[PDB]
Write an enzyme that holds these catalytic residues in place. Sequence first.
Site, PDB file in Angstrom:
ATOM      1  CG  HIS A 118      65.944 149.944  59.568  1.00 44.93           C
ATOM      2  ND1 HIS A 118      65.208 149.529  58.618  1.00 44.93           N
ATOM      3  CD2 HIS A 118      65.676 148.876  60.557  1.00 44.93           C
ATOM      4  CE1 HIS A 118      64.843 148.393  58.835  1.00 44.93           C
ATOM      5  NE2 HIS A 118      64.928 147.774  59.649  1.00 44.93           N
ATOM      6  CG  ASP A 139      65.663 151.757  56.073  1.00 43.76           C
ATOM      7  OD1 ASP A 139      66.557 151.918  56.678  1.00 43.76           O
ATOM      8  OD2 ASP A 139      64.776 150.892  56.991  1.00 43.76           O
ATOM      9  CB  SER A 159      63.876 143.686  58.740  1.00 41.29           C
ATOM     10  OG  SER A 159      65.208 143.944  59.256  1.00 41.29           O
TER      11      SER A 159
END
Lengths: 162, 162, 48
Positions: free
Chosen positions: B40, B62, B114
């Site tokens: 993402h 993801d 992230s």
Amino acid sequence: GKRERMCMKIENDCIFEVKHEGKVTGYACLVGDKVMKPAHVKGVIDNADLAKLAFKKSSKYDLECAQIPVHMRSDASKYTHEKPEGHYNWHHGAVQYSGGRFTIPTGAGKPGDSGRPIFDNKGRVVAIVLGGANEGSRTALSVVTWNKDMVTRVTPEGSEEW
Amino acid sequence: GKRERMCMKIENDCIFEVKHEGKVTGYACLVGDKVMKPAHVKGVIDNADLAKLAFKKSSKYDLECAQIPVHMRSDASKYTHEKPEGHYNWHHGAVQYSGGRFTIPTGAGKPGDSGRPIFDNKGRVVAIVLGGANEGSRTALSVVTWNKDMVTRVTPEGSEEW
Amino acid sequence: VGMSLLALISIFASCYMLVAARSKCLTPYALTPGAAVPWTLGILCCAP
């Protein structure tokens, strides 16, 4: 000791009592992704967010469980299923599990403390109280407990309702 | 003290940031001949030697990954496939794996970092962060973590991308 | 001409569906760092 020191601290925010037209009648415990309380107490949980949920009632196990809000998961206790021989913590003193019966000397525990979780020395809930039965000088608890997979309810003979 | 320094030494040249229009928006980790990163996060890694790779995207996990060129395969992490209850390390403080959940204190942990991984006591990558579920004072983490065979994603309810 | 177009459409759709099924069955192993694909499942799905 320190077990009674720490259990009160954990139990401080793991309890959300339920009020019957302004009268305390039971407690709701916030353990492990689920809000649960016994099914015999009436009223509304005093908590603001926990008042309006879709609880699931099971008359067989005398228990009622919901899904705890996301924004208060951090205030949840620890759960377990293994319950070896020994002694266990309680709000109104201490309890010991012997021969499949949770024993308490009589007098301790009044009708009005149904839903008090029972902890171990490590602060992990093993049980929830539902009632009692005098056997001479002591009392056995009608208690709903757990296993590795399913919830279980064990009740003694000729017990009262708290 | 020592473990923090060890974990930071492992990721000194094990983390490549995936910039977008010159700004940092994420990272990519190097482990087991796999340049794995969240699918993402948008942008391109600075390294041109790593820009000329063909990833295999997956919307389910993801997770998009590629192969590592043999030039820098020495500078790759190590991986583990077991998560006993305990203490695990992170770039921002420390994390706890309680009841199948990766947990951090709130505040610490913000969007934009992230991609960075999670280490263990022995100093090996155990999981890759994707996002967190903010709640109370402990931020539950949405993680992609590989079991012994497959790649698994664990996401708490109400979590949002970092 | 209509029947020929329909037959080619059916063949292409079926082949695409097998390709997608093979992709879904084989792609998790391409993400795991260990990447120990069973040789039997490699035989069926032509896994390198």
